Structure formats: C-alpha cells, structure tokens
C-alpha cells in the first residue's frame, strides 16, 4: 500500500515558519532614475557602475524584463540530463514522466535573463501536490539582479530526496517566478515521479 489520505499529516511543515518582522518592498525606482540621483558623487557613480555594468540594451517591445530560459537538475548520480525549456510551449510538461531517484542529494540550476530594469528580490516558489493535496510549500530566493546580455545561472542549496519506502508516488508540481513587486514573470505546472531506481 503506497499512499492513503495521511497526506494531510505530512503538512508537519507548511506555514508557521513566517514569524518575522516583514521586509518592506523597495520603491519602484528605475535605472535611469538611479543613474541621475547623485551624479555629483564620484564614489557613488563607481558604485552604480560596478553593480549596473554599462550599456547593451536590445529588444524593448516584444521582450519583457525577465525571461527564464530553463531549470536544470544538477545531480552527479543522475545518468540522464533533467531540464525544462521554459520557452514557448509549457503544456508539454503536463504529460511528462520526470523520474528522480529517492534519497539522492541534489540542487536546482535556475537560468534566467534580465533585459531592461532591475528585478528586486526574485524568488522561485514551488508547490508539491500528491493526489491534489498541497503537501509542501518552498521558497528559493534568487535575489535582485541587473540587466545584461549574458544570462545568469543561480543554484539552490543541496537538498535530499525523500525515501520511497512510503511516498514514492507521482506528484503534480505548480511553480512560478515572482518578486518583491508581485510581478508574475512565469507560471507553469509539471509532473514528477519518485522511484527506487534511476530510470527503472
């Protein structure tokens, strides 16, 4: 017997880990505005230059500020590559069989690209569902970034995979990339499956 409705008991995490004096999002200023705030201060210009770099801004119409390219599963034990082309068709992910061997330590490689402005405190929210029940809430802060031609590649901390002796089923995963401005850059769903062996 794999699973029952003891999924609600698994919520021995959920929400109660908030208890913190809230941050407070920063005003919605902009690069050009930042650039003109203290032109008089040589020290501050050097400061903005190190953080903001210099020039190179392409497509303004079609292209949004943030554009996630992919999500890669970095694992030394995984024989076959695990990626998700977060470009174009996303419905395809609603019928894939993503296997992930139990108990293995792993990490996520987020690959995005900032185009025009600053992305303040961008985060990756992941919701894990089993039989329609949300049994896990997870937030991976990526941080604030500036616009540039070359793509960024963020890695999440090393985490362990669950032991299949019980919960070795298939999950519905809902994910989205938002930020301090509540802007929803992307949102999609996909299915993952735990097993006892790699590609069994």
């Amino acid at each position: 017997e794999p699973t029952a409705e003891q999924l609600a008991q698994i919520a021995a995490e959920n929400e109660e880990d908030e208890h913190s004096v809230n941050y407070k999002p920063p005003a919605q200023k902009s690069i050009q505005e930042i650039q003109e705030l203290d032109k008089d201060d040589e020290s501050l210009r050097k400061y903005k230059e190190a953080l903001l770099g210099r020039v190179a801004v392409s497509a303004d119409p079609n292209v949004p500020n943030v554009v996630v390219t992919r999500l890669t599963l970095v694992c030394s034990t995984a024989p076959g590559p695990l990626e998700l082309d977060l470009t174009g068709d996303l419905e395809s992910f609603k019928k894939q069989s993503f296997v992930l061997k139990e108990g293995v330590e792993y990490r996520i490689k987020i690959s995005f690209r900032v185009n025009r402005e600053i992305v303040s405190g961008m985060k990756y929210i992941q919701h894990t569902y089993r039989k329609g029940v949300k049994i896990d809430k997870t937030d991976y802060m990526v941080g604030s970034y500036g616009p540039r031609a070359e793509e960024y590649e963020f890695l999440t901390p090393m985490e362990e995979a669950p032991k299949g002796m019980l919960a070795r089923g298939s999950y519905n995963i809902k994910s989205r990339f938002t930020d301090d401005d509540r802007t929803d850059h992307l949102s999609w769903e996909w299915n993952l499956t735990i097993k006892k062996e790699w590609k069994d």
């Binding site: 004096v21 930042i34 400061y47 405190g121 941080g143 604030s144 970034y145 901390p157 985490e159």
Partner: protein
C-alpha cells in the same frame, strides 16, 4: 595544496554609521583624516586565519532609502554580512531590527551575519554623551547588544572603533570564521 577560498563580506547599516571608515581603516590602517568617500570601492585582501590563506572581498553599501533597490544587487553570493550601528546613536541601533536584519535575511536566507558596534571611543566622550543623556538616551553596552544579537540570531556581536582601531582586525577575523561555519540544513523534506 588546496585552492584559495574567497570570502565575500558585505557591510550594511544606516548612513554615517561608519561602514566606510571602518573599511579604509582596516585596509590601510590609517583612519580617514580629511577625505571620506560615500562608498569604499570593492576590494580584496589575503587574510591569514588558522594557518590558511583567504581572499577577503570587502563590500561597502549605500544605506539610503534612495538605494533600497540598488543595494541588494551586491547581496547574491555573499558569505557574511556585517550589520553595523554606532554606539552613540540609538537611531541606527533601532534601525538594525527594523530595516537591516530583515533586508538581509530576506535576500540571503541561510547567510550568517554579525552586529557591529562602530565608534566605541565615543562610549566615553564629552560632546557626544552631552546630547545623549539629555534626550533620554544613553550609550549601548556589549550586554545590551548581545541580547539583540542572540534575539536576531546573529553569529555574534563585536564592536570596534575605526578611530582607535580597537577590535577592528578582530571584526574581520570573526567575519571570516563566521563565514567558514557550515550551513546546517534544517530543511528536512522527508517525513
């Protein structure tokens, strides 16, 4: 032998609290007499700790509200934060709990940090204590700060004077050690 490891140290705190002077003081040994920039340039220094070379990268910040959006651009990949506050200035000490700690814990979850009492020479100074004890406000003590630090879960509390360089070399030594201590998961996904 083994590769040289880099420690990225980011200093935060309100304006005029002494983040900049503390950095020039530490990297040149000479306190800034005449000139003092808004922001100290990104700088690296080899530091010997426990018999091992470490490249300590130093990052000064523009703590104004005007830069609450720009400032965090340096936060990614940080190894340790140094939240600083002047002893003879409760306005900063308060802002530590209100603005600072939440800003860094928001952007860098599992990243350690320390509280820094800047200007300890002023704990005992005429003109400064003068305006203090007047408006119902007195200088902070290690005991006072250690309470807030442990409350905030800061690796530790350290203090110093960029003027008298008392405790300076030590602030960065603890900064290094604070950054060497392993993460400690506490993110158990199994049930």
């Amino acid at each position: 032998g083994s590769h040289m490891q880099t420690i990225k140290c980011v200093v935060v705190g309100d304006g005029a609290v002494g983040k900049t002077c503390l950095l020039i003081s530490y990297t040149t040994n000479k306190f800034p007499s005449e000139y003092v920039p808004t922001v100290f340039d990104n700088y690296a220094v080899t530091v010997m700790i426990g018999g091992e070379p470490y490249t300590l990268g130093l990052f000064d910040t523009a703590g104004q509200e005007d830069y609450d959006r720009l400032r965090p651009l340096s936060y990614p990949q940080t190894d340790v934060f140094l939240v600083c506050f002047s002893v003879v200035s409760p306005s900063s000490f308060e802002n530590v709990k209100e603005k600072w700690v939440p800003e860094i814990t928001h952007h860098c979850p599992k990243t350690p940090f320390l509280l820094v009492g800047t200007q300890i020479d002023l704990r005992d100074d005429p003109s400064t204590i003068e305006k203090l004890a007047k408006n119902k406000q007195k200088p902070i003590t290690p005991e006072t700060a250690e309470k807030l630090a442990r409350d905030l879960k800061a690796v530790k509390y350290v203090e110093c004077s960029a003027l008298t360089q008392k405790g300076l070399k030590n602030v960065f030594d603890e900064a290094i050690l604070a950054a060497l201590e392993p993460p400690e998961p506490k993110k158990s996904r199994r049930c």
